Design a protein around this ligand. Sequence first.
Ligand SMILES: Cc1ncc(COP(=O)(O)O)c(CNCC(=O)O)c1O
Ligand SMILES: Cc1ncc(COP(=O)(O)O)c(CNCC(=O)O)c1O
Ligand SMILES: Cc1ncc(COP(=O)(O)O)c(CNCC(=O)O)c1O
Ligand SMILES: Cc1ncc(COP(=O)(O)O)c(CNCC(=O)O)c1O
Lengths: 453, 452, 461, 453
Amino acid sequence: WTGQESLSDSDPEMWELLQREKDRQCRGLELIASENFCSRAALEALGSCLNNKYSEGYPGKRYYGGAEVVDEIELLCQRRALEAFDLDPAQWGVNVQPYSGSPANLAVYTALLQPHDRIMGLDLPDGGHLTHGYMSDVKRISATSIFFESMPYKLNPKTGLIDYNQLALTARLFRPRLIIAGTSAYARLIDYARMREVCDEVKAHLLADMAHISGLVAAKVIPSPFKHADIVTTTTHKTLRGARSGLIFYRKGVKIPYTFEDRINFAVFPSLQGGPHNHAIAAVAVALKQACTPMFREYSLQVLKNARAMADALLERGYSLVSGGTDNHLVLVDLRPKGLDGARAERVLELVSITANKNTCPGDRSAITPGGLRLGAPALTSRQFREDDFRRVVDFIDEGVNIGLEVKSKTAKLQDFKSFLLKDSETSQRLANLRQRVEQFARAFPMPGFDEH
Amino acid sequence: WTGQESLSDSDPEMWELLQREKDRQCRGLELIASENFCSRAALEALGSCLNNKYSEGYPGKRYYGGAEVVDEIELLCQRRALEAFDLDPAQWGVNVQPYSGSPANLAVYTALLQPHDRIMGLDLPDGGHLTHGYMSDVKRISATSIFFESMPYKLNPKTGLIDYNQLALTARLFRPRLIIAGTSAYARLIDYARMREVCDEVKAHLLADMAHISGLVAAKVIPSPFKHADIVTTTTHKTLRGARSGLIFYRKGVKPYTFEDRINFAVFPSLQGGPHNHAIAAVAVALKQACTPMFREYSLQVLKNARAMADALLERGYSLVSGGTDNHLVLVDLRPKGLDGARAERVLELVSITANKNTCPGDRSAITPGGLRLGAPALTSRQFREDDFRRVVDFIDEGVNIGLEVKSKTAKLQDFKSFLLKDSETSQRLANLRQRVEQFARAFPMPGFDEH
Amino acid sequence: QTGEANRGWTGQESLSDSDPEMWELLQREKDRQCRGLELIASENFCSRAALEALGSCLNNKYSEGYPGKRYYGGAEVVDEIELLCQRRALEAFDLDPAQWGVNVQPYSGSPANLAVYTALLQPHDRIMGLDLPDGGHLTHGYMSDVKRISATSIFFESMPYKLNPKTGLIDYNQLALTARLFRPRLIIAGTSAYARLIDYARMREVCDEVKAHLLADMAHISGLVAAKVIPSPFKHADIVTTTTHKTLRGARSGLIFYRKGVKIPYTFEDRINFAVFPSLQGGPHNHAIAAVAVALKQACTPMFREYSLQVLKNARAMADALLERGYSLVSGGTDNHLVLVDLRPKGLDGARAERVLELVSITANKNTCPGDRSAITPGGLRLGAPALTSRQFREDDFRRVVDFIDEGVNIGLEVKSKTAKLQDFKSFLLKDSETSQRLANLRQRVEQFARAFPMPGFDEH
Amino acid sequence: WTGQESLSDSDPEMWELLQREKDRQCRGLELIASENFCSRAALEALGSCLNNKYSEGYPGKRYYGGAEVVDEIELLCQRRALEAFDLDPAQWGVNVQPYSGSPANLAVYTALLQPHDRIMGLDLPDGGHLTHGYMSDVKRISATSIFFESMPYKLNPKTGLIDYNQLALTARLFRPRLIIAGTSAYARLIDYARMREVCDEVKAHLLADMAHISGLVAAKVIPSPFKHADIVTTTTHKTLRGARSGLIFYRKGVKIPYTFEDRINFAVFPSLQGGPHNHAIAAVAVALKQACTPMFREYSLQVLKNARAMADALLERGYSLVSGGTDNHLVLVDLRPKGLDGARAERVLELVSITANKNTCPGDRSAITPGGLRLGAPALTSRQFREDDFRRVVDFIDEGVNIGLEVKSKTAKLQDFKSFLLKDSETSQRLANLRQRVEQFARAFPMPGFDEH
Ligand SMILES: Cc1ncc(COP(=O)(O)O)c(CNCC(=O)O)c1O
Ligand SMILES: Cc1ncc(COP(=O)(O)O)c(CNCC(=O)O)c1O
Ligand SMILES: Cc1ncc(COP(=O)(O)O)c(CNCC(=O)O)c1O
Ligand SMILES: Cc1ncc(COP(=O)(O)O)c(CNCC(=O)O)c1O
């Protein structure tokens, strides 16, 4: 046994699964707003001998020897991270070790807050992330609501925008130590200057969690949270089009000096994590280099143009959009006007190889049947889709909604609806014909990555 | 731009860095007990399109659609993890999503304990891990000592073994809700039956963190913690020779056990986000390798190589903490030899021999460890046999003797280290030994890709 | 060797002979009480009968535990006393013992509240109370922008609710809105400085919506509730705390009332009793329990209802006389035993005013008013009727009190015109002879008026 | 109604209860070690107009005016507290507001410790107090085990003394922030120097809770904890013979200053308490002045002699004593070498007007039938009992034990034993005969306080 054999020869069962997943990615219209297609070059680094190295600590201050090269790699990743976001190294630093977005946010809280200290984030149903402190009326869900004390802030339900007035009012009462400015499902730009004004008033730290918009910020196609935030976290796998990982950026130097750097780094290691994933660090450095180029600015501009074109095509077809439209990479569709909920539409669309996700809308009454869908442009933009192609995407979505509207007319419950899509041969024929046309269209576009896996 | 360009063309700077790390691995005697050389096959899965897929939730109970294939992959990984450890699904389940070892242990605590509930693990200086609740006299270090309340248990310093008697005595006073049985630096087998007795007496959960020994357990060359533990965590990148990831195994069925829902909920949605499906797949590749006769022979050889290295050090007048080994590693006490582990680790590093300093019970300076931790898994993966490990020990001894000369000529640690670099006479002797070490090491096979 | 050198200690000596220094101090405090216009809204004058029980051999008895469930024997009499106090507590508030129980051991009001929190909540569970500047109490969860002040904000997680600044009333609408976001496990309805009746029905609505416990802390109003002169919180709360020394006119102590029996049963009783003992307290203060029982029996009488109705009438007379002299009142009036004066329009703050009044033997306390721009210089005064009502003051007597207050306010306005900082104002009251003589004349007139009225308790101590 | 009517005229029911309790105190042999008989002078202050004054805050730093006289009283009480313990006011301060012992200890923890910080105290079954952190295997019992994290230390079961070696060992592992040296049932002197050594080694605060022994310390008849602890709590109603209350003493001044004073005072008010009980403060001040006198040193010497006389008489009658003897005001009798448990014995004695309490002994296996009794000398010594009188006390105890043995031989369960004492005519006649002799003896001795209440 050498350990130099190929995957296709040594584990045919797993090789076939990898090929099947690649085929799914190539034949579908992937609209999940948080997905993208990582470059072959980044994946070549991800799947490398860097996986083998234990390097707990930080460059020059490791616990083990043999770190000469991973030191150089980690420091290069830091430099490319600051370069990608146009940050002066004397005013900003970055921790490139977080294993994903959720680890990054937990490390920030652990660095800057004591257990049971208070945080405020946008409520999950209103478009925030689990790690912004989510708990429900009946139990504590995110660990960020167990180890810390959270209170959400909300959209203004009439407008679909973050209610900055109510946030200010309730932060004066709750006295958060940290407020999170960032979203998983919000189509508008965040008023970071106002967020900072609230935080300065109540003496809270401002954390911007820019995971969804990070590449747009790097490409300078939307305003940067770094102009107003103390700390900025992100993932590397969304609009940044990298391998799955996290980053934490923090201010350093003169404010009296800043005191984030030592606390942030200590929280990541030794408090929370173990050995870094040097293969992920390397892949991230590759993608960060890509994000610095003119190619990536043009990609990011096309992401916005494509999201806008998707929004307009939906409005032209009588759909409604939460907040009335978009200013970023995604659109929040409200389907209740058309008479079909997001759980139903999501399933019909899945069966024709269009992947989206059901999304709660302002005013929704039940979670099992949310009113909306979240649709994103980053992934398909990476396949060189343009505006006209996203109009075809909406054409196909509308066909699927129409199919769903007929099945809803012949079915009672969410489970009846779902089996009907499989049982009724007349329904599964229309699904099959739509799926074939969907896959013919999607299969025709290029795809980043390896050829077959 | 296609995103299909090769790394070698599109990012030369990073490509030469990857090649440099591969060269470093190939030319070294890599004795870090937690390291291994992952197979090309697993690395091919690790760097795949599985990176692209968001799949929050669990097979058949995802937040989103499109998960047909990742569902099959995640379920296959679970099946292969149970098979590698000879586990019946009716008695055991597994969570294959933890991003690493430390995430795995934190998920167990979050799942079973309230904030500030009490845990006991082996103290870090005595061989336990950070995530077993480590804090120092000076401040709280691991988050496992911040969100939970930890009190360590200790070695008997006269034997080098876990002091099960004192663990029993202190557990009755401290009342832990969970006790961790598992080590980062311990060369003997843990008495899991005794740990079970203590846990039963004080009504604590028994967690076995088998990260270091996981490959040996799968290979059935040492006894298994699954006979006595409620929960077992592990990494997949040490003796299991996989990609970097974690696993949480838990009892289920009649005892009914109530671990499964809590464990799975803690990993997601409580602690983690989207799974790293490329990592899950790579782990599944390694787990299948771990079920083969090849891997049992590998693991038997790891044991024999550790024993051979131990016996050679004893022959050269080294002392061993607990007097020997029954697993993949050796704990060397350099104190009698007159050199500490901080000094020895650095001299060895400069001759391409990678180990790490290790505290010894006989230590008089809590700041400067008196020992080294040496492991056989990595070099065994390159087909080293017992005689090769004897030659490793002769190279170590050459380096230790250099260290002793430099100690006689320098005062503080920093002085020692700088002298190794800049004293021309010393650097020449180090260069000679380094060349012999490297040319020896380069001649062995190496798992993975050819050049990266 | 003769006299006191030839006499052994008995522990039966009178205080006046055995400790002349302390005896002189007690008499001086009695004199201070008799010669002052005592307007602190939380104060009262305890009866001789209750004080005689407070200073009794019941001090000597350790009785950890509860009646019939004690750690030590010899408890037959203290058991009867504690049970009597419980029965008299329930009688005073018209409570069926099949539906309500009472714990009579809390050492004071703050211990009573902490015991409820410890009984029903886990550490760091959430509570909501009226903010301290807005009229709430420390133990309702107070912390400031700069640090945690009450232990109820240390061991538990509090967020305040607020007055509507424009009406001076509790903003029930905002409480409902914020409770939904904060998800409290317990909400406190009760105040230290609030002149209006609390809408306990609305508070129960909010608590029912968000699945919180409703605690009514009726300390200030307890005697008014007992006398049935204002609505009872027991109609809507299932837990009620109080002190025994404010409007109930007893010895310093606390009480915790709780629902019991069929709600499927209530499960307050065992937890609240356990929190008080063994969790928080040690041996009860049986002398205090007995004194409280004496005052509770008094509170059941027609005499006490007539007292409580007079407290309301006197507070209203004080309010009306203030309004006639151009004073502003927070919420525009009073429905209870106290008045909240807003001095800002008159041009004088509550810190300045309380000090002038103090120097003429009128004891009130400065009080934050809605819109105050600075707490060193709060805008108002809190003025209470219970203590002077116990001395048989009637409405015209409270009109005379206001005349004296207004004279003091006028002296303060004159001193403010002559000084800059609060520290200079205060020194001027003492060092300027013109001012000092004006204060002495007003003090003489205040004291001669007050001394003529009867006083509960012993004659001289 | 004037509020000037006497208790006897206005509430005859309560008046009769007070007289019944007074009669019970006069006719019994009160051996509860934490009890005493407070002076009339102290009681006159306790039942005074001082009840009426709200005085939140501290002297010269109050919330409300009118505090001129209560300021003088509180400061006088502080000076008298320092004087009774021979403390230099430039090196020690004292807080006289705690409402009882348990409030005093909770205030110390709240002042010096964060929530969930670690405390160690002597385990309750081994002689410690609830407020030293007690929890059982099954439930958190004391609030000091809920808001803080406690671990007990133990007696050496062979010797009956605190095991200082094991305390040192376990404190190194548990890392307490505070260790309590003080007991509710311990007959020996505590090695405060050794406790301090341990605290200095692990960097814990040493709190001496001297409640039981405070009068013996003030009289200088046993060594003072103030030589080795820098924080000391106590009650005022045990051997100090005052009204029920608490005190917290702390070092102040140059240690770089001590920082106890401001934290302790703030913990008491505003954190934990509300208005002080000025009547109690005054009564405490009266008792403290008494404690400064030669009379009180003679009383305390006699307490020691009487406890030793009682111990000696029990040994001569074949009883065993936990730890082998006594050095203080109490004796821990082990009844197992007589064959009668403490639950049975306590009840027998109660029915013959001798009040003691059952006490767990080393080796006991059931808390429901512990092996012993705790007996104290302070209360009866305050009635002018001398050594021969305590020998008579032991004679009566032994008769009671013998009755208990006879009933034990005729009954099964604890419940049957207890009902036999009341319902067996022969046993009831024997108890009545013993009770009359006990009461005839006890009534002949004087009693501090009022004549009839
Ligand atoms: C027993 C044990 N448990 C958990 C971990 C954590 O694994 P991660 O580094 O992936 O978080 C380690 C790592 N120990 C590394 C070493 O011994 O060198 C470990 O030794
Ligand atoms: C704002 C935000 N923050 C953090 C995360 C967490 O990243 P990980 O999944 O790597 O833990 C997400 C993921 N959001 C996924 C989605 O919106 O579909 C996110 O949207
Ligand atoms: C509503 C309320 N609750 C509890 C207390 C506390 O009682 P103790 O001081 O006995 O702890 C007060 C005292 N407040 C005093 C005042 O308003 O002036 C109070 O007003
Ligand atoms: C050492 C010690 N500390 C504090 C207390 C508490 O005092 P309070 O009961 O006033 O809260 C006691 C009471 N112990 C009483 C006994 O031993 O019988 C005590 O023994």
